[PDB]
Design an enzyme around this catalytic site. Structure first.
Site, PDB file in Angstrom:
ATOM      1  N   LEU A 182       0.833  -1.194   0.000  1.00  0.00           N
ATOM      2  CA  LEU A 182       0.000   0.000   0.000  1.00  0.00           C
ATOM      3  C   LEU A 182       0.874   1.253   0.000  1.00  0.00           C
ATOM      4  O   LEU A 182       2.078   1.207  -0.268  1.00  0.00           O
ATOM      5  CB  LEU A 182      -0.952  -0.019   1.190  1.00  0.00           C
ATOM      6  CG  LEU A 182      -2.330  -0.631   0.948  1.00  0.00           C
ATOM      7  CD1 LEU A 182      -3.157  -0.558   2.218  1.00  0.00           C
ATOM      8  CD2 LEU A 182      -3.036   0.066  -0.202  1.00  0.00           C
ATOM      9  N   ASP A 183       0.261   2.400   0.283  1.00  0.00           N
ATOM     10  CA  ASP A 183       0.960   3.672   0.376  1.00  0.00           C
ATOM     11  C   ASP A 183       0.640   4.327   1.712  1.00  0.00           C
ATOM     12  O   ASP A 183      -0.288   3.929   2.421  1.00  0.00           O
ATOM     13  CB  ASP A 183       0.578   4.602  -0.782  1.00  0.00           C
ATOM     14  CG  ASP A 183       1.667   5.601  -1.105  1.00  0.00           C
ATOM     15  OD1 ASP A 183       2.746   5.523  -0.482  1.00  0.00           O
ATOM     16  OD2 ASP A 183       1.443   6.465  -1.978  1.00  0.00           O
ATOM     17  N   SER A 184       1.442   5.337   2.061  1.00  0.00           N
ATOM     18  CA  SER A 184       1.208   6.092   3.288  1.00  0.00           C
ATOM     19  C   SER A 184      -0.109   6.859   3.227  1.00  0.00           C
ATOM     20  O   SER A 184      -0.844   6.928   4.223  1.00  0.00           O
ATOM     21  CB  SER A 184       2.375   7.043   3.540  1.00  0.00           C
ATOM     22  OG  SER A 184       2.779   7.678   2.340  1.00  0.00           O
ATOM     23  N   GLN A 233      -2.774   4.504   3.908  1.00  0.00           N
ATOM     24  CA  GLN A 233      -2.889   4.288   5.348  1.00  0.00           C
ATOM     25  C   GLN A 233      -3.668   5.415   6.013  1.00  0.00           C
ATOM     26  O   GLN A 233      -4.456   5.173   6.935  1.00  0.00           O
ATOM     27  CB  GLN A 233      -1.504   4.155   5.974  1.00  0.00           C
ATOM     28  CG  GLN A 233      -1.474   3.299   7.225  1.00  0.00           C
ATOM     29  CD  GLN A 233      -1.314   4.116   8.488  1.00  0.00           C
ATOM     30  OE1 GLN A 233      -0.700   5.182   8.478  1.00  0.00           O
ATOM     31  NE2 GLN A 233      -1.866   3.618   9.589  1.00  0.00           N
TER      32      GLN A 233
END
Lengths: 171, 104, 128, 606, 87, 177, 459, 101
Positions: free
Chosen positions: E41-43, E46
C-alpha cells in the site's frame, strides 16, 4: 375584625348568573364541592378552637400616652425636659409614618378595586394621598439620619420665615 | 524549597542570565526576561504570550485541564490565559476585517 | 491571489503558516533536542515522585511557588521610580478620582440649585 | 373568592413541597422523578381551575398575605397579583414543564445525579412562578435572580467540562448587566413615586418616565438576549437538552418581555421608549435569523430561532400590542419546547451527535419524531390555522397598518423569510436525503415517556393556539380593514422563503465546489460578535485588573507613599543621630554651641 | 442506547470494512497484514484507512497515534485501549 | 513541534497531516457523500501528481503553498467528532472520573458491601508495592547519564516483573463510569 | 451590661482550671450558653434606647454586633482546635485566654456610652489580636503584617484621642446622650476641618478606606483562622460603629467634607473588586472582597440618609457572617492541601460534594442573592446613593457585575473542572467542619426571614 | 554544607486511620463523641431553635405595630370632625417667636 371607617370600601354589586346555554359550567359544581369537602371541616375545627378560647378569656389594652410639653417650651441645654420632648416627637413621627402608610394602602386598594376605571373613580383617594404626602414632606423631609426635634423646629422656622417674607414681597 | 529557588533581581551580566535560565528550567538562548523598566517583573521570563487553547490538545499533560506540565515555567498571565478566559487562537479571517465589518 | 494572514495581539499566526517551522538547520535541531531533553528530565522526575506508592500528599511544584512569589512578593524590590512609573501612577491613580469628583460635584451643585429654587419635581419624594 | 385564592396558593405550596421532601430525605428515593412529575401534573390541574374561573367571570385578585418589612413610609408584604397575564401564563408553563420532565426522565436515565437534576428543574420552575405572580418589585427581583442562578447551575451541570462553566459565567455576566438596568428602574421608581408595588405606580402615572423605561428596556435586553447582549443565549446550550428545552426556549427567556408586559401603561404613554425598543427588537430578530441561516449545530439553530422569536415579541411590544406579545409567548412556548424535545430524541438516537452534516434519511426510521418535527416547523413558520398563525401573523397584521419605523418593518419581513429558510434547512438536512451517521445503527424511539410527552405537546401545538385565541377577552381594538397586499404579506414572504431555500438546498445537491464569500463567513462566525468582544472586553479588563490595580497602585505606589517613605525617613534620621564617635570634646563643643545659640539668637535669657 | 463492544466484534468490524477497499484483495489480507510491506500500500492509503476507521467507530484517532498503526491487529488493540473493552 | 516521541516533525509527517486536515475540511464543505467522493479523489490525484519529487526545496515550497491554499479554504466551523477536543461532548464525563485512592477512605461499614472487590484491590496494591522498587531500579540502570533525552519509557525487561511506572496508566478511570 | 461581662471574665478560670482533654468542650459549651444569654438585648423601644447605668447602654445598632460577637466566639473555638491539636497545653490555654479577652473587650466596647471609654477599649482590642497574629501565624510575613496593622491603627487614631479630649474640654461632657442633647453646629473654619479629619481618619483606617487598606491583605492572610474571623467580622464593623457614633457631632461640615472620601471609596470598590479577578491567592481574594464591601459601607455612612444607615447595618452584619464562612472554607482547603494558592487544588466537587454545596451557598450569599440580607443592605445603599446623585448608579451597577465575576470564579477554580491528579490526600469532610459551616450559614438564612432586628436604630 | 540540628517536619496525621468513626474534634474517641454531642446540642437545639422562637415572639419590637394601631385611632378621629388629615406644621405656629427683620 377591622374598622370600616378607617378602611373604606364601597358596597359591592354582584350580577345574577343568567346563562344562555345548556352546558353546565364546572365552576358551580366545583364551588359546591368546595363548601362540601373544605369549608365544613375547616369551620368545625374553627368552632372547636373558638369554644376552647371562650373557655379561657383574658384581655390586653392599647397603651395611651399623655401629652408632655414639646421642644418649643423647653429650656436649652436642659436635658430633663428635652428628653421627654424628643421622645414625644419620635413617637409622633412613627405615628405619622403609619398614617401615610394607611393612605398609601387606601390608594392601592382603590386602584385594584376599580380596575380599568381607576384613573376616574379614584380621584378622592389620590387627592388625599397628595395632601398627606405634601404635609409629610413639609414636616419631616431633608433632616438626615441624625434627625431630632431641634432640626425639625429649625426647618419649620425657616419655612415660616420664607413664607412670611414671600407674603411681604407680594403685599 | 530553598532561598535560591525564588525569583531575584533583573540579570545584567551573562552569568546571572545563565543561572536564571538554569533556575527556570529553560535554555539560556531561550530565556528572555522582561525589560528593566522598574515595573517589578524582575528576572521572570517573557513567554511567547499565547493562550492555553493554542497548546496541543492530544499530547498527555501533567495537568490535562490546564494543558500544562510539571516544572514548566508558567506565564506571567497564566491566570488570564486559561481555557475559561480570553483566547488568542487564530481566526479564519483577519482581525481588522472583523472589526471593520462589524463596525460597518 | 489569496489574502495573506497577518498576526494580531488577540489572533496569533497559525503554526502551519509560520516560516520558522520550515527551517531545517542543524542549530534548530539542536535547540529542539535540548528542549525535548529538558522536558523529558522534568517529566521523568514528576512521574518518578508521582507513581510512588508510599507517598501520600501533594507533589509540590517549584514552578508554581516561583510564579506566586514573583506575582506577589517580588514586585516591590524590583520597582524603581522613574518617569514611566510615576506618570503611569499619577495618570491611573488620581485621574479617575479627579474626574469622578468633578462629575459628582457638578451634578449635585446643579441639583441643589434646582431644588432650592423650587424647580425640580419633588412631589411624592418622601423616602430619602 | 375563597375557592380562587385557596386553589392558587395550593398550586404554589404543592410546587414547593417536593423540595422539602428531597431535603428531608434519608433513604434512596423510590423514583423521585415520578413524584415530581405527578406533583407538577396535579399542580397543572389545580391552576387550570382558576384560569377557567377567570375565563368565565374575569376575576383579578391581589393577596398581600404576609407583611414582611415596614421601612418607615414604605411597606413590603408578600403580595401575589394574579391578573390576565399571571393566570394565563402559569398553566401553559406547567403543561410545558410536565412534558419536559417526562422527556427528562427518559433522556437523563443514565445520570447518577438525576434526583439533583429534577430538584434543580423544580427550583427553576418555583423561581419562575415567583417572578410571574409577583406584585411588588422586590419579589419579582427575587424571581429574576433566582432564575438567573438556576440557569447558571443548569448550564454548568456538567461541571467537568470547561465550556459549560464558560457559558454559565457568560450568561451570568449578561444577566447581571440586565440586573444593572433593573436596579436603575427600581431606584427611579422608589425615589420619584415612593413605592415598589405596581398599583401605586400605575395610579400615579408619571410623565417624565424616560429613565425607568430605559432601565426596564436594559433589563429586558439582558434577560431576553436582544442585540448587544445576545450571544449568551446561543452559546449557553452546553447543558442537557431538557435544560435547553425548558430554560432557553420557553419559560426563562421571555422574562424580559413579560416584565415589559407588566409595565404596559408606562410604555403606552411614551413614544421614545416604544420607538427604540421596536428598533432593538427588529435588529435582534434580523441579526439572529441571518446568523441562523448558515449554522450547522441543530441546538444552535433552535437557539437563534427562539432569539429571533423574542425579537419579534419585542417588535410587537414596540407597536403598542402587549396582549398580542403575551399571546405570542403562550403560543411560542409549545412548539419551541416541542422542537427541542424532537432535537433531543434525534440526539439520543444517534449517540450524542449534534452536527447536522452527519445525519440524514430519518424520515422513515423515526416516524413519530419526524411527524412532530414537521408539525413544529410548520407552526414556527406560520402555517395557517396552526398555533403560530393565531399569534405571529396577527403581529404582522399590526406591523404593516400602524405608525411604525419603515426599516424595522422591512427587516422584520426579511427576518420572517429567514425563519422560513432555516426551518426548511432544518427539515431538509436533518430528515430528508441519505444517511450519514456511522454504520452501527441504534435508532429507537419506543419509550412510553418520550412518546407520551411528544404526543401531549403535539396536541398542544395543534390546538392550544386556537383555544387560547378564542378564550381570551378582547383587550384592544383589532385592526382588520386593510388592503389585500397587506393581508397576505406574511404568507407570501414565507412561501418565497420556502422557494429560495429549496433552491439553495438543491444547489447544495449539485456537483460543484465553491469557495465561501465574505457574507457566508459573516453569517457563520456569528457576525464576528463573540469573537471580537469576548477577546477584547476581558483583555482590556484583566490587564487593567493586574498591571494597574493589583501591581502599580496597591503593590507599589500606595505601599510607597504612606508607609515606606516614612520608614525610610525615620531610618535615615536614626542613622544620622547615632553616628557619634564617642568623643567628649565634640559633645562639649556642642554644649558651647547650644549655650551660645540660646543666649544670642533664640533669646532665652530675657 | 450504546450497546457494548467486544474484541471479536471490533475485529470483525475492522476486517469487514477492510475488504471493502478496492486497493486490497480480500483473499490475501489477515489480521497481521502490513500495508506497505505485505500488501504494497501507500502512506496516503494508510491515512485513508485511518479516516475510514474514524468514520466507522465514530471517534477520531489522533495523528500521532495514526502514524503508528500498521496492521489490523494494531488498530484492534488501539480501539480496545481507547474504549476499555472486555471488563 | 510538540511530541512525546520525537523532538520535531519531518516533511512527510507535515504532508500527511496536511492531507488529513484538508480531507476533513473538504468533507465538511461537501456534506453529501458522492460529491465528497468526487472531490476527495480529485484531491488524491492532486497529491499524487507531485508525489515523486526529489528536490527538497521544491517540495518545501509546494508544502508552504498548499498550507496557504488550505488556510484560504477552511470551513469556518468544521466538523468535530463529539469526543474530540472542541466537540459537543468533549470532556463531558470528567466529573464522573473519581480516582481510585478515594476507595482507601471508605468506611468499613460500606467496605463490607464489597468483600471480593476489596480483596482484589488489596492484592493489586500488594503487587504494586512489590514491584515498585524493581521498576525504579530498572529505571536507574537503563537511561544514560545526564537525564533521559526522550519521554519514552522502557518496558518490563526481565520475567516476573512489571513495566516501570504502570500504576497510573493501568488503573485509570473508564471513559463512561 | 454586667450580666455579660462577668461570665465572659469567668470564662478564664473555666479555661485555666480544666483538664488537658476537656478545655475545648467546656469553653464551647459555656460560650454557647453566653450566646444564648445574649438574646435579652432585643428589648428595644421605638423612641428610647436601653440604658443600663451611667457606664453602659445599648441601642438597636450595638445589639446585632453584640449578638454576632458572642455568637462568633464558639465558632472560633471550634475552628481553631485542629491546627492547635499538637500544641502545648499552656499555649493552648493562652490562645483561648486571648480569644476570651478579645471578646470581653469587644462587647464592652460596643456598649460604652462615654466616648473615651469606647476609645480605650477600641484600642485595647489591638493587643490580643496582634498577639494572636504574630504568635500563631504560620509563615515569615506575620511579623511585618502585625507591624503594619498596629502602626496604621495607632498612627490613624492618636489624633482621635486628641480630638475627643478637646470635645470633653469644650462641650463639657463625652456621654453620648448628653452629646445627643447638647450638640452644636460646627461652622466653616480650618480648625473644624482638621477636627473632622481627626475624628474621621481612625475609622477611615479601620474601615478600611481605599488607599489606607494596605494592612488588610497581610493581616487577613498571615493570621490563623480565628484571627481571620475577628479580623473580618467584628473589628471592621467596630470601626463602622464608631463612625456612626461620631458623625453626629460633625454637622454640617460633613456635607462638603465627605466629598473626597466618597470618591476614594466610589472608585475604590471598583479597583479592589478588579483585583479579585486577578488574584492568585484565595485569602487575598476574600480580603479584597471585604475591602470592597466595607468601602460601600463607607459611602453609605458618609451620605448620612436613613435608608443608607439601615443598609449599612444590614450590610455589616451580613458581610461579617459571609466573610467568616468564606474564611472557614478557605482554611479547610488549606488544611487539606497545605498550600494557600487557588489553582493548586481543583475539581473538589467530585470528591467533597457537601462542602461544594456549602461553597455554592456561601458564594451565592457573597454576590447579594435575594432575599438575603446582603442584598437588602446592598439594595438600600443603592437607593440612598441614587438619591444622592444619579451617575452613582453606574458605579454601583458595574460593581454588581464584577462582584459576581469573582465570586463564581472563586466557585469554579476551587470546585469545578478536572481534579488535580497528584494530590491524593483529600480526606472526606469531618463533622466538625460541616457543623461549623452550618452554624455560620443557618443564622444568616434565618435572619432573611425576620430582618427588622438588624435594620439599625432608626428602623 | 553542614547545617544546624533540627527535627525534620513530621508527616501529616490522618484522624480517620486510628479512628474510622472520628468526628474530627479530638483523637480520643469518647472525647470526640462528647464534643460532637455538646456542639450539636447547645448550638442547634438550644441557641438556634429557641433563639428563632424568641425572635419570632418578640413583644412588639420597636413599638412598630403599636403605631399602626395609633394611626387607626388618629385617622378615625380626624376623618370624623372634618379636620385636615395632616397639618403642614409639626408644632403650633402661634407659639413660635420668629426673629424680626
Amino acid at each position: 375584625s377591622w374598622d370600616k371607617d378607617v378602611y373604606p370600601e364601597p358596597p359591592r354589586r354582584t350580577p345574577a348568573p343568567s346563562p344562555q346555554t345548556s352546558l353546565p359550567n364546572p365552576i358551580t359544581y366545583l364551588t359546591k364541592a368546595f363548601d362540601l369537602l373544605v369549608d365544613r371541616p375547616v369551620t368545625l375545627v374553627r368552632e372547636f378552637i373558638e369554644r376552647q378560647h371562650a373557655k379561657n378569656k383574658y384581655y390586653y389594652y392599647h397603651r395611651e400616652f399623655r401629652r408632655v410639653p414639646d421642644i418649643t417650651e423647653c429650656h436649652e441645654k436642659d436635658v430633663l425636659c428635652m428628653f421627654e420632648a424628643e421622645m414625644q416627637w419620635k413617637r409622633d413621627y412613627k405615628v405619622d409614618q403609619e398614617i401615610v402608610n394607611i393612605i398609601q394602602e387606601r390608594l392601592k386598594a382603590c386602584q385594584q378595586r376599580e380596575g380599568e376605571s381607576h384613573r376616574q373613580n379614584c380621584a378622592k383617594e389620590l387627592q388625599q394621598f397628595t395632601q398627606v404626602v405634601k404635609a409629610y414632606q413639609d414636616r419631616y423631609h431633608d433632616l438626615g439620619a441624625h434627625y431630632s426635634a431641634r432640626k425639625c423646629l429649625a426647618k419649620q422656622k425657616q419655612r415660616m420665615l420664607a413664607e412670611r417674607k414671600a407674603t411681604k414681597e407680594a403685599a | 524549597i530553598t532561598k535560591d529557588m525564588l525569583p531575584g533581581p533583573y540579570p545584567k551580566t551573562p552569568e546571572e542570565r545563565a543561572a536564571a535560565a538554569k533556575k527556570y528550567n529553560m535554555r539560556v538562548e531561550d530565556y528572555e526576561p522582561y525589560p528593566d523598566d522598574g515595573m517589578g517583573y524582575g528576572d521572570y521570563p517573557k513567554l511567547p504570550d499565547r493562550s492555553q487553547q493554542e497548546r496541543d490538545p492530544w499530547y498527555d499533560w501533567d495537568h490535562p485541564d490546564l494543558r500544562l506540565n510539571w516544572g514548566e515555567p508558567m506565564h506571567w498571565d497564566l491566570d488570564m490565559y486559561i481555557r475559561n478566559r480570553v483566547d488568542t487562537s487564530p481566526t479564519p479571517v483577519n482581525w481588522n476585517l472583523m472589526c471593520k465589518h462589524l463596525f460597518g | 491571489s489569496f489574502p495573506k494572514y497577518e498576526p494580531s495581539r488577540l489572533a496569533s499566526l497559525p503554526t502551519t503558516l509560520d516560516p520558522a517551522e520550515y527551517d531545517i538547520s542543524s542549530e534548530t535541531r539542536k535547540a529542539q533536542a535540548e528542549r525535548l531533553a529538558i522536558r523529558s528530565r522534568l517529566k521523568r522526575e514528576y512521574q518518578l515522585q508521582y507513581n510512588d506508592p508510599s507517598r501520600r500528599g501533594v507533589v509540590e511544584d517549584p514552578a508554581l511557588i516561583r510564579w506566586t512569589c514573583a506575582r506577589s512578593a517580588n514586585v516591590y524590590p524590583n520597582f524603581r521610580p522613574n518617569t514611566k512609573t510615576s506618570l503611569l501612577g499619577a495618570l491611573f491613580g488620581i485621574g479617575p478620582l479627579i474626574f469622578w469628583y468633578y462629575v459628582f460635584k457638578t451634578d449635585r451643585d446643579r441639583k441643589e440649585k434646582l431644588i432650592q429654587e423650587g424647580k425640580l419635581d419633588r412631589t411624592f419624594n418622601i423616602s430619602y | 373568592m375563597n375557592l380562587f385564592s385557596s386553589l392558587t396558593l395550593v398550586t404554589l405550596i404543592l410546587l414547593t413541597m417536593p423540595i422539602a421532601a428531597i431535603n428531608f430525605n434519608t433513604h434512596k428515593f423510590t423514583n423521585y422523578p415520578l413524584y415530581v412529575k405527578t406533583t407538577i401534573s396535579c399542580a397543572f390541574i389545580t391552576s387550570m381551575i382558576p384560569t377557567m374561573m377567570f375565563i368565565h367571570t374575569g376575576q383579578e385578585m391581589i393577596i398581600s398575605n404576609w407583611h414582611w418589612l415596614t421601612i418607615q413610609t414604605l411597606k413590603l408584604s408578600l403580595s401575589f397579583k394574579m391578573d390576565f397575564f399571571s393566570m394565563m401564563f402559569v398553566p401553559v408553563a406547567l403543561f410545558v414543564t410536565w412534558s419536559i420532565m417526562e422527556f427528562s426522565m427518559w433522556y437523563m436515565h443514565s445520570d447518577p445525579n438525576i434526583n439533583q437534576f429534577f430538584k434543580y428543574l423544580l427550583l427553576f420552575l418555583i423561581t419562575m412562578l415567583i417572578l410571574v405572580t409577583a406584585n411588588n418589585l422586590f419579589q419579582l427581583f427575587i424571581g429574576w435572580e433566582g432564575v438567573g442562578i438556576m440557569s447558571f447551575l443548569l448550564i454548568g451541570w456538567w461541571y467537568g467540562r470547561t465550556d459549560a462553566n464558560t457559558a454559565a459565567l457568560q450568561a451570568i455576566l449578561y444577566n447581571r448587566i440586565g440586573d444593572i438596568g433593573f436596579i436603575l428602574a427600581m431606584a427611579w421608581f422608589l425615589i420619584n413615586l415612593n413605592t415598589w408595588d405596581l398599583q401605586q405606580i400605575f395610579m400615579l402615572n408619571p410623565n417624565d418616565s424616560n429613565l425607568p423605561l430605559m432601565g426596564l428596556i436594559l433589563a429586558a435586553t439582558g434577560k431576553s438576549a436582544q442585540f448587544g447582549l445576545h450571544p449568551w443565549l446561543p452559546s449557553a446550550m452546553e447543558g442537557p437538552t431538557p435544560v435547553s428545552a425548558l430554560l432557553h426556549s420557553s419559560t426563562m427567556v421571555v422574562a424580559g418581555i413579560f416584565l415589559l408586559i407588566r409595565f404596559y401603561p408606562l410604555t403606552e404613554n411614551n413614544k421614545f421608549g416604544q420607538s427604540i425598543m421596536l428598533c432593538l427588537g427588529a435588529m435582534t430578530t434580523l441579526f439572529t435569523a441571518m446568523c441562523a441561516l448558515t449554522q450547522n449545530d441543530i441546538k444552535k439553530i433552535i437557539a437563534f430561532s427562539t432569539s429571533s422569536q423574542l425579537g419579534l415579541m419585542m417588535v410587537t411590544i414596540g407597536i403598542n400590542q402587549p396582549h398580542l406579545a403575551f399571546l405570542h409567548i403562550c403560543t411560542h412556548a409549545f412548539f419551541k419546547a416541542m422542537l427541542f424535545m424532537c432535537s433531543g430524541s434525534i440526539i439520543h438516537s444517534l449517540n450524542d451527535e449534534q452536527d447536522i452534516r452527519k445525519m440524514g434519511g430519518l424520515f422513515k426510521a423515526m416516524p413519530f419524531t419526524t411527524t412532530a418535527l414537521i408539525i413544529g416547523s410548520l407552526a414556527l413558520t406560520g402555517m395557517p390555522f396552526l398555533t403560530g398563525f393565531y399569534s405571529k401573523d396577527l403581529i404582522i397584521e399590526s406591523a404593516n397598518t400602524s405608525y411604525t419605523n419603515a426599516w424595522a418593518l422591512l427587516m422584520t419581513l426579511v427576518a420572517t423569510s429567514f425563519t422560513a429558510i432555516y426551518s426548511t434547512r432544518i427539515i431538509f438536512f436533518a430528515l430528508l436525503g441519505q444517511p450519514r451517521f456511522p454504520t452501527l445503527i441504534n435508532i429507537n424511539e419506543n419509550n412510553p415517556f418520550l412518546i407520551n410527552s411528544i404526543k401531549r405537546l403535539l396536541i398542544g401545538s395543534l390546538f392550544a393556539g386556537f383555544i387560547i385565541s378564542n378564550n381570551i377577552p378582547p383587550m384592544t381594538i383589532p385592526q382588520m380593514t386593510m388592503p389585500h397586499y397587506l393581508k397576505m404579506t406574511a404568507l407570501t414572504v414565507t412561501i418565497l422563503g420556502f422557494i429560495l431555500a429549496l433552491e439553495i438546498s438543491n444547489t447544495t445537491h449539485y456537483l460543484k465546489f465553491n469557495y465561501p464569500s465574505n457574507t457566508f463567513k459573516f453569517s457563520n462566525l456569528l457576525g464576528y460578535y463573540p469573537t471580537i468582544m469576548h477577546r477584547l472586553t476581558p483583555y482590556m479588563n484583566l490587564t487593567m485588573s493586574q498591571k494597574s490595580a493589583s501591581s502599580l497602585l496597591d503593590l507599589i505606589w500606595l505601599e510607597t507613599i504612606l508607609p515606606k517613605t516614612i520608614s525610610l525617613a525615620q531610618m535615615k534620621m536614626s542613622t544620622t543621630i547615632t553616628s557619634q564617635k564617642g568623643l567628649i570634646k565634640l559633645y562639649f563643643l556642642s554644649f558651647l554651641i547650644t549655650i551660645l545659640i540660646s543666649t544670642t539668637l533664640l533669646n532665652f535669657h530675657e | 442506547d450504546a450497546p457494548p463492544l467486544t474484541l471479536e466484534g471490533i475485529k470483525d468490524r475492522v476486517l469487514y470494512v477492510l475488504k471493502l477497499y478496492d486497493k486490497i484483495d480480500p483473499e490475501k489480507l489477515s489480521v497481521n497484514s502490513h500495508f506497505m510491506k505485505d500488501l504494497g500500500l501507500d502512506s496516503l492509503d494508510q491515512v485513508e484507512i485511518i479516516m475510514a476507521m474514524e468514520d466507522e467507530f465514530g471517534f477520531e484517532i489522533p495523528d500521532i497515534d495514526a502514524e503508528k498503526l500498521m496492521c489490523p491487529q494494531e488498530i484492534v488493540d488501539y480501539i480496545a485501549d481507547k474504549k476499555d473493552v472486555y471488563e | 513541534a510538540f511530541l512525546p516521541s520525537a523532538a520535531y516533525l519531518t516533511h512527510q509527517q507535515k504532508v500527511l497531516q496536511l492531507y488529513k486536515r484538508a480531507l476533513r475540511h473538504l468533507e465538511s464543505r461537501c456534506v453529501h457523500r458522492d460529491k465528497y467522493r468526487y472531490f476527495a479523489c480529485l484531491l488524491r490525484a492532486r497529491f499524487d501528481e507531485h508525489k515523486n519529487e526529489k528536490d527538497m526545496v521544491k517540495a518545501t515550497q509546494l508544502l508552504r503553498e498548499a498550507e496557504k491554499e488550505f488556510w484560504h479554504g477552511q470551513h469556518p466551523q468544521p466538523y468535530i467528532f463529539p469526543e474530540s477536543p472542541g466537540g459537543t461532548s468533549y470532556e463531558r464525563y470528567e466529573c464522573y472520573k473519581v480516582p481510585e485512592w478515594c476507595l482507601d477512605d471508605w468506611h468499613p461499614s460500606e467496605k463490607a458491601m464489597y468483600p471480593d472487590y476489596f480483596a482484589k484491590r488489596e492484592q493489586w496494591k500488594k503487587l504494586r508495592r512489590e514491584s515498585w522498587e524493581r521498576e525504579v531500579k530498572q529505571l536507574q540502570e537503563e537511561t544514560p547519564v545526564g537525564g533521559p533525552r526522550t519521554e519514552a519509557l522502557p518496558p518490563a525487561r526481565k520475567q516476573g516483573d512489571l513495566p516501570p511506572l504502570w500504576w497510573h496508566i493501568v488503573t485509570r478511570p473508564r471513559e463512561r463510569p | 451590661m454586667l450580666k455579660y461581662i462577668i461570665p465572659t471574665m469567668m470564662l478564664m478560670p473555666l479555661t485555666w482550671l480544666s483538664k488537658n482533654s476537656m478545655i475545648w468542650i467546656n469553653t464551647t459549651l459555656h460560650s454557647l450558653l453566653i450566646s444564648l444569654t445574649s438574646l435579652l438585648l432585643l428589648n428595644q423601644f421605638g423612641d428610647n434606647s436601653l440604658n443600663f447605668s451611667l457606664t453602659f447602654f445599648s441601642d438597636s445598632l450595638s445589639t446585632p454586633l453584640l449578638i454576632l460577637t458572642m455568637w462568633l466566639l464558639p465558632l472560633m473555638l471550634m475552628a481553631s482546635q485542629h491546627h492547635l491539636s499538637k500544641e502545648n497545653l499552656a499555649r493552648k490555654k493562652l490562645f483561648i485566654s486571648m480569644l476570651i479577652l478579645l471578646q470581653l473587650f469587644l462587647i464592652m466596647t460596643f456598649t460604652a456610652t462615654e466616648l473615651i471609654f469606647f476609645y480605650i477599649m477600641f484600642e485595647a482590642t489591638l493587643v490580643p489580636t496582634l498577639i494572636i497574629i504574630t504568635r500563631w501565624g504560620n509563615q515569615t510575613e506575620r511579623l511585618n503584617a502585625g507591624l503594619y496593622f498596629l502602626f496604621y491603627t495607632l498612627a490613624g487614631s492618636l489624633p482621635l484621642l486628641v480630638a475627643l479630649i478637646y470635645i470633653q474640654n469644650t462641650m463639657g461632657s463625652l456621654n453620648f446622650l448628653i452629646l445627643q442633647y447638647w450638640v452644636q453646629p460646627m461652622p466653616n473654619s480650618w480648625s473644624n476641618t482638621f477636627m473632622w479629619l481627626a475624628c474621621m481618619m481612625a475609622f477611615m483606617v479601620k474601615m478600611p478606606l481605599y488607599g489606607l487598606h494596605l494592612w488588610l491583605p497581610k493581616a487577613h492572610v498571615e493570621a490563623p483562622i480565628a484571627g481571620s474571623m475577628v479580623l473580618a467580622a467584628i473589628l471592621l464593623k467596630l470601626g463602622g460603629y464608631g463612625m456612626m457614633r461620631i458623625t453626629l457631632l460633625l454637622n454640617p461640615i460633613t456635607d462638603f467634607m465627605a466629598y473626597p472620601f466618597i470618591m476614594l471609596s466610589l472608585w475604590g470598590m471598583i479597583m479592589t473588586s478588579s483585583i479579585c479577578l486577578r488574584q492568585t491567592d484565595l485569602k487575598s481574594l476574600i480580603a479584597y472582597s471585604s475591602v470592597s464591601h466595607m468601602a460601600l459601607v463607607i459611602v453609605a455612612i458618609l451620605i448620612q440618609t436613613p435608608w443608607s444607615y439601615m443598609g449599612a447595618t444590614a450590610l455589616m452584619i451580613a458581610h461579617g457572617l459571609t466573610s467568616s464562612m468564606l474564611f472557614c472554607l478557605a482554611n479547610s482547603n488549606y488544611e487539606r492541601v497545605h498550600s494557600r494558592t487557588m489553582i493548586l487544588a481543583r475539581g473538589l466537587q467530585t470528591l467533597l460534594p457537601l462542602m461544594a454545596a456549602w461553597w455554592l451557598l456561601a458564594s451565592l450569599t457573597n454576590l447579594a442573592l435575594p432575599p438575603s440580607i446582603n442584598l437588602i443592605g446592598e439594595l438600600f445603599v443603592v437607593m440612598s446613593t441614587f438619591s444622592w446623585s444619579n451617575i452613582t448608579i453606574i458605579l454601583m451597577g458595574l460593581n454588581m457585575v464584577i462582584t459576581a465575576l469573582y465570586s463564581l470564579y472563586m466557585l469554579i477554580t476551587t470546585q469545578r473542572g478536572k481534579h488535580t491528579h497528584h494530590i491524593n490526600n483529600i480526606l472526606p469532610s469531618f463533622t466538625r467542619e460541616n457543623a461549623l459551616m452550618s452554624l455560620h450559614m443557618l443564622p444568616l438564612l434565618l435572619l432573611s426571614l425576620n430582618p427588622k432586628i438588624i435594620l439599625g436604630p432608626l428602623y | 554544607t553542614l547545617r544546624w540540628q533540627e527535627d525534620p517536619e513530621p508527616e501529616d496525621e490522618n484522624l480517620y486511620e486510628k479512628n474510622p468513626d472520628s468526628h474530627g474534634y479530638d483523637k480520643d474517641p469518647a472525647v470526640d463523641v462528647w464534643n460532637m454531642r455538646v456542639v450539636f446540642f447547645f448550638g442547634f437545639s438550644i441557641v438556634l431553635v429557641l433563639g428563632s422562637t424568641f425572635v419570632a415572639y418578640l413583644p412588639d419590637y420597636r413599638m412598630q405595630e403599636w403605631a399602626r394601631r395609633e394611626a387607626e385611632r388618629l385617622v378615625k378621629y380626624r376623618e370624623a370632625h372634618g379636620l385636615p388629615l395632616m397639618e403642614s406644621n409639626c408644632f403650633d405656629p402661634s407659639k413660635i417667636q420668629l426673629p424680626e427683620d
